[PDB]
Amino acid sequence: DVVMTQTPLSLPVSLGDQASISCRSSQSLVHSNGNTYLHWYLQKPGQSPNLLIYKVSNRFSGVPDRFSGSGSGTDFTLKISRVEAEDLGVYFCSQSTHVPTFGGGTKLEIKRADAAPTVSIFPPSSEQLTSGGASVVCFLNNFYPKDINVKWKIDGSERQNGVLNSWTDQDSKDSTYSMSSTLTLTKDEYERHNSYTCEATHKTSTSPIVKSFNRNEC
Amino acid sequence: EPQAPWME
Amino acid sequence: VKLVESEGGLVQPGSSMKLSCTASGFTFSDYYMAWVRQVPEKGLEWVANINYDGSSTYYLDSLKGRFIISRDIAKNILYLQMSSLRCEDTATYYCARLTNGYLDVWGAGTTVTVSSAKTTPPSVYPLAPGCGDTTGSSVTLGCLVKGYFPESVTVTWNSGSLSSSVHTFPALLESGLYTMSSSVTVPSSTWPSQTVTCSVAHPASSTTVDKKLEP
Numbered sequence A: 001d002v003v004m005t006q007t008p009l010s011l012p013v014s015l016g017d018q019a020s021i022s023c024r025s026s027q028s029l030v031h032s033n034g035n036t037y038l039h040w041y042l043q044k045p046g047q048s049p050n051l052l053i054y055k056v057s058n059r060f061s062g063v064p065d066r067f068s069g070s071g072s073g074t075d076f077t078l079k080i081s082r083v084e085a086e087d088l089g090v091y092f093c094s095q096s097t098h099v100p101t102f103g104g105g106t107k108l109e110i111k112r113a114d115a116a117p118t119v120s121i122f123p124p125s126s127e128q129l130t131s132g133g134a135s136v137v138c139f140l141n142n143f144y145p146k147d148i149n150v151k152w153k154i155d156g157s158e159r160q161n162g163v164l165n166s167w168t169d170q171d172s173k174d175s176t177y178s179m180s181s182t183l184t185l186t187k188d189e190y191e192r193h194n195s196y197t198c199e200a201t202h203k204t205s206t207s208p209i210v211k212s213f214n215r216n217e218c
Numbered sequence B: 001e002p003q004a005p006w007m008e
Numbered sequence C: 001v002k003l004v005e006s007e008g009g010l011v012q013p014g015s016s017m018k019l020s021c022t023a024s025g026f027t028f029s030d031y032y033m034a035w036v037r038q039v040p041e042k043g044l045e046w047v048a049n050i051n052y053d054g055s056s057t058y059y060l061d062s063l064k065g066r067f068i069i070s071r072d073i074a075k076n077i078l079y080l081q082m083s084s085l086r087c088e089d090t091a092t093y094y095c096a097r098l099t100n101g102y103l104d105v106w107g108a109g110t111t112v113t114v115s116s117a118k119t120t121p122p123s124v125y126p127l128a129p130g131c132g133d134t135t136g137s138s139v140t141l142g143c144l145v146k147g148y149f150p151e152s153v154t155v156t157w158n159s160g161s162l163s164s165s166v167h168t169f170p171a172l173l174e175s176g177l178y179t180m181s182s183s184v185t186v187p188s189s190t191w192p193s194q195t196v197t198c199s200v201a202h203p204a205s206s207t208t209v210d211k212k213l214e215p
Helices: none
Strands: A004-007 A010-014 A019-025 A038-043 A049-054 A067-072 A075-080 A089-095 A106-111 A118-122 A133-143 A149-154 A163-167 A177-186 A195-201 A209-214 C003-005 C009-011 C017-023 C032-039 C043-050 C057-059 C067-072 C077-082 C091-099 C102-106 C110-114 C123-127 C138-148 C154-157 C166-174 C177-187 C197-202 C207-212
Touching (some): A004 A089, A038 A067, A038 C102, A049 A067, A075 A089, A118 A209, A118 C138, A133 A149, A133 C123, A133 C177, A149 A163, A163 C177, A177 C166, A177 C177, C003 C091, C017 C032, C017 C110, C043 C067, C057 C067, C123 C197, C138 C197
Parallel strands (some): A010 A106, C009 C110
Antiparallel strands (some): A004 A019, A019 A075, A038 A049, A038 A089, A133 A177, A149 A195, A163 A177, C017 C077, C032 C043, C032 C091, C043 C057, C067 C077, C091 C102, C123 C138, C154 C197, C166 C177, C197 C207
8 A cells, every 4th residue: 555645735935936845655656667657636726636747757738847747766756946826726646556546735825925804794694584593704805824813702702612714725816815704603692692793813913803793783 | 558557 | 628527416325326427529448537536634545447448447445346437438428336335435526537547637526425414405695784884995795605415505696797806615514514605895886786696506406596685
């Protein structure tokens, strides 16, 4: 059972700079027939994998010369020169010399200047309330870096339980991320409190961004 | 010319 | 080019299902074919492959012969029969063309969910500014898609004609049902004067919900 170990797990790089990704195999990938069946694939956000490099160093049709694969035996490298934003995604190595297996992937992240989130809050819709549910939503849009914390307060008190946080992958259009934070309550609990607040801590600011509403004005 | 080398 | 997988969807544990994949644009019996699957958290796993005429196949050993890969050369179709499914078979399955040991064409992928739970369509709720908030030069609207099973849904805005400023957030499971959301931003002068509607398609329940956003 041949293990493919990729290094690093995530790689941040500036546009125009070079990225280098390592793939090691636990057994030599030189087949008895002399070929080395070591290949590289790229999976962009929301897409299927696509072939980038086959048999160590061969660029697939449509892949620019910026992408270069090298190595031998058990040690392989993918180098991407002059990184462009659309290069971002997960790079996987694969071997098919033996029973075929895949590396765990390396996520290429594009560096940009720190950008603050645009934060929006929404109360539960009357449609949802009509059904006994109450979700409060905060969208945090177009921020960088990806690390960000959202804290919900109900009548001033933090509520940890019932929160679903979901990040997008990185957008190649502007190298930013967005995330959705949803606090789901029952209508019963929702109607017993008035103040609903989402606070975003991100470091593009010293003080958290706060967005809030009062249920009675809604 | 294998196609599926490990099958060899 | 192109490989297109059949709809996957929900299957009860212990039950069986068959995926198909339709190939266009090449001499089908001139290429080996393969199935690969991807789980979140995570990793790709080779499932099976088949030679030109179908006389020789390879299978991931741990499948214990429960899966059968086959091809109809007269119809340009690749099949994966899957028997006695367990939760561990839940994944996105990709059809792929195999050449000299590498996969040089991949399908879009189709998800298969092995669960005893019932198919449930999405509830789709509007997300609009409320509560006496003021409004600037733009407005961010959204849709909250809650309570559905299995994955996946697709959300579009104005039948796809609004696309530039859209964010779609990955689904999360909670209490055995999925929740996801989508946001779009438009200039304030243009809403509500020029309507904005989110369309949510959920193949597993054969349902589409087209929710109009109101102030």
